């Protein structure tokens, strides 16, 4: 109890009349809040998913995207997706951790040829149209698009280059339309029995069967370099808490305190504020554009007001410089003054000479 704390701090079994500072009142953070500015721009993976005509397998479109927040959660949320196999990276860790740049390649190919477009796997089309490097870190997204990309008559929009003179370089797209010299006799630009044109036309039809239907296949390439990383998943955010002492993480400021609305007006470029002593005084909420004042958690000295143990064993506790809305247990004749909020003493309007000085004109005493 406070009286025994006073006895220990005085190292005497009898404490004389007076006020003794025994301990320190401290308010610990109840909650922890983390905020980052929300999505705003979004990296358009759905756009290359939603492209009406996917690029040719040999002339695969290379889309390098940077400086945007990427939402990979919608990719898992999307039901029509059928294949999400990943190599060197967790499918669900794209949101958690990020790379510097992302390459998206959109192409339409038959179902059996989808497995041919994979690292460490070579195919009749893959070796000459699109050969994924063995060691790249990325995910291949594939799904059936027979209804969207085929008709009863037949879809000949998508074609591939069957014959190529040399092995394809990694991350290289071949757009050459030269007639392949399959035969020993020179082609000279004229199709013949020996010379076969490398490009062949697929026919996509619903009746053509599964394993050969068109598949909208998108491969995402992630590479992290010395340059700063600009595309990342949505970092965790929490709700805003006002008038309660909480740990706050406003884009990595990492401070503790109680957050209140402030009348101060920041400049548009400015993010947080500092006082004369170079202490964070106000922060702007990244989610909104409002300005939040940061005042520290309430703390102060705990002083025990006691008459002599010869007189009595009752004690009144003073919490210096603390609003006792934030605070012997409260509810026992709790009275508030400038020196602090006094617990255990009842304010009396009549005035006597000072007995135990509390502060700011308030003096405690033991009387009936």
């Amino acid at each position: 109890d406070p009286l025994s704390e006073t006895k220990c701090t005085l190292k005497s079994f009898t404490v004389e009349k007076g006020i003794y500072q025994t301990s320190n009142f401290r308010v610990q953070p109840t909650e922890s809040i983390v905020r980052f500015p929300n999505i705003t721009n979004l990296c358009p993976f759905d756009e290359v998913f939603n492209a009406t005509r996917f690029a040719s397998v040999y002339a695969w479109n290379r889309k390098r995207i940077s400086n945007c927040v990427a939402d990979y959660s919608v990719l898992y949320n999307l039901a029509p997706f059928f294949t999400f196999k990943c190599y060197g990276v967790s499918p669900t860790k794209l949101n958690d951790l990020c790379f510097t740049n992302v390459y998206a390649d959109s192409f339409v190919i038959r179902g059996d040829e989808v497995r041919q477009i994979a690292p460490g796997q070579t195919g009749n089309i893959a070796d000459y149209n699109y050969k994924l490097p063995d060691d790249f870190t990325g995910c291949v997204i594939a799904w059936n698009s027979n209804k969207l990309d085929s008709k009863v008559s037949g879809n000949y929009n998508y074609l591939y280059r069957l014959f190529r003179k040399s092995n394809l370089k990694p991350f290289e797209r071949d757009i050459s339309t030269e007639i392949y010299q399959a035969g020993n006799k020179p082609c000279n630009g004229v199709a013949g029995f020996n010379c076969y044109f490398p490009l062949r036309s697929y026919s996509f039809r619903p009746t053509y069967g599964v394993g050969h239907q068109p598949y909208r296949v998108v491969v995402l390439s992630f590479e992290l370099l010395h340059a700063p990383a600009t595309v990342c998943g949505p970092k965790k955010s929490t709700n805003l808490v006002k008038n309660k002492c909480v740990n706050f993480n406003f884009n990595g400021l990492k401070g503790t305190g109680v957050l209140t609305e402030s009348n101060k007006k920041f400049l548009p470029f400015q993010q947080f504020g500092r006082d004369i002593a170079d202490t964070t005084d106000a922060v702007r909420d990244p989610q909104t554009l409002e300005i939040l004042d940061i005042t520290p958690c309430s703390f102060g000295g705990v002083s025990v007001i006691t008459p002599g143990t010869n007189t009595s064993n009752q004690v009144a506790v003073l919490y210096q410089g603390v609003n006792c809305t934030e605070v012997y247990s409260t509810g026992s004749n709790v009275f508030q003054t400038r020196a602090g909020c006094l617990i255990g003493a009842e304010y009396v309007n009549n005035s006597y000479e000072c007995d135990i000085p509390i502060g700011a004109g308030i003096c405690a005493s033991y009387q009936t």
Partner: antibody
Amino acid sequence: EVQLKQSVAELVRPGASVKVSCTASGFNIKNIYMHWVKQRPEQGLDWIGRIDPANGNSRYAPKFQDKATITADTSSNTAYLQLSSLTSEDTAIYYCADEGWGFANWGQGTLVTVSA
Amino acid sequence: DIVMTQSPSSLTVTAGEKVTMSCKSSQSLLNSGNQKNYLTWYQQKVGQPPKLLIYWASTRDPGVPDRFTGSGFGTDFTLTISSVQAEDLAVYYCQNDYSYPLTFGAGTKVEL
């Protein structure tokens, strides 16, 4: 492509700790929060837990609580196993995981048993 | 923690014989956002580490790809193989994924 190497099996004194390393080759471990699993010969497979390279916050199976601990080091893509005072039946072959939709990448396996 | 019961029946059959293997999954696991459920199967050749056989319970990964369709609402999923050969001769475990407590398959073998 992407390979996870298991540490060679070390004979361990009875009632002591045993450590097995799962280093990643061909790719940094930073993008992978690998999972540890234990398999006993002629017995069902079990899931030990997982490690994240940064803020690892490893969460273990309820049966293995307070006795099975696993950690990894981001530098050199190394991982580790921490298991001590294992009985012969409890000891099982440990594998690493790709934590995908299914565990695509698995270690070659470590047959570790208390033999001293 | 999720209750699982995998049929360990083993059949010594010639190639071209279908086999049906299913294991119950309690709580009827259902991923939010997408209709796909996170249930997977593994194929482990004797003396070799297991590898991903099937993921999402209805999607066939590249690598010996053939059918393996499974129909269920999270209460149960059935994995079917059209033909049995030495390559498919292995031990299979079905492990739930949507539920964070992960319990692996008891084990199922096939013979030629």
